[model samples]
Target: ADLEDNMETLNDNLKVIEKADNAAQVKDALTKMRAAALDAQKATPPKLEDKSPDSPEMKDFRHGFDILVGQIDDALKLANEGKVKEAQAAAEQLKTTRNAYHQKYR
Candidate 1:
């Protein structure tokens, strides 16, 4: 549930970027999205009982969430450098990725 909340927040930030008219606004939204990703990372992950820690399922569980954060970091880096178009593209990619994640893992 916490993971969903964080993804929803990042999605909201993407919407904000879509409507933003300037770099400052994009930067602000990116900052908030990055913070949400951090919070999500710190949240407890769902546990599997009686399974080996090295199982493929366990690896996928961590990978799914980390991929979103990685994309967010990429977007934020572009935002910080004032690359509005590139940053927006990254945010758009995040949106698509989030939707796919929801269907597959959420």
Candidate 2:
């Protein structure tokens, strides 16, 4: 599957979580978001597909996904603890993180 689709899910899930009414809904979105981040981490960005796996560019691509996964994990933790506001605060950071990497990778 294309990493682009995974990225799209991250974006979609982010939106879903943003409007969620409770921890249960937030947890659901975060779960899907985390999965997308994990899947994205396993693939090479099209822009760097020709580079060596360990190349700086490849590493950067993987690092971006890792960053996303880290944030999602944090948000999920807060959601699990029933801290809806805190979890949403944590989840919101993904926008900046994804946008920064998207600009660089594009």
Candidate 3:
């Protein structure tokens, strides 16, 4: 089930990146996933998924979610302002975090 939680969150994040045309869209996606992560963490095994670059995943995804939301906003702004590379880099960081987290759980 930890793997299940990670897969679910990763899928959501991928969908967000695929469809997000702007920062607001990214934030909305993150918000939904964060809630999902919270639910997973509360499960019998506490299969917490979707966290930041930190080592430990938080019991509550609120703080990490907020940080990711901000990062997405910033990345979107950068992307819109002709800094696609920078924006992508930031997004890449988020993706890496997700992948790393899944690696452990899976």
Best by lDDT: 2
Error of 3 at 82 (Å): 16
Every model's Cα RMSD, please? 4.1, 3.8, 7.4
lDDT of 3 by residue, 1-106 (tens): 4446545766876687677735566656655655655554444334443443475555345454455544545554455566664555655454444435444534
lDDT (10s digit) by residue, model 1, range 1-106: 4455565776777678678636688777768877877776655445332264666655555676588777667666676777676655554453566355454334
Candidate models: Cα lDDT each: 0.64, 0.67, 0.54
**What value does the lDDT take at residue 52 in candidate 2?**
67
Model 3 spans > 4 angstroms off: 46-89, 98-106
Q: What residue pairs are clashing in model 2?
A: none
Regions more than 4 Å wrong, model 1: 1-3, 47-59, 85-95, 102-106
Query: What does the lDDT read for residue 41 in candidate 3?
Result: 43
**Candidate 2 lDDT tens digits, 29-66:** 87887777777777555645645656676666666567
On TM-score, the stronger of 1 and 2 is 2
Question: Candidate 3 deviates by what RMSD?
Answer: 7.4
lDDT of 3 at 46: 45
Point out the worst 10-residue segment of candidate 3 by lDDT.
43-52
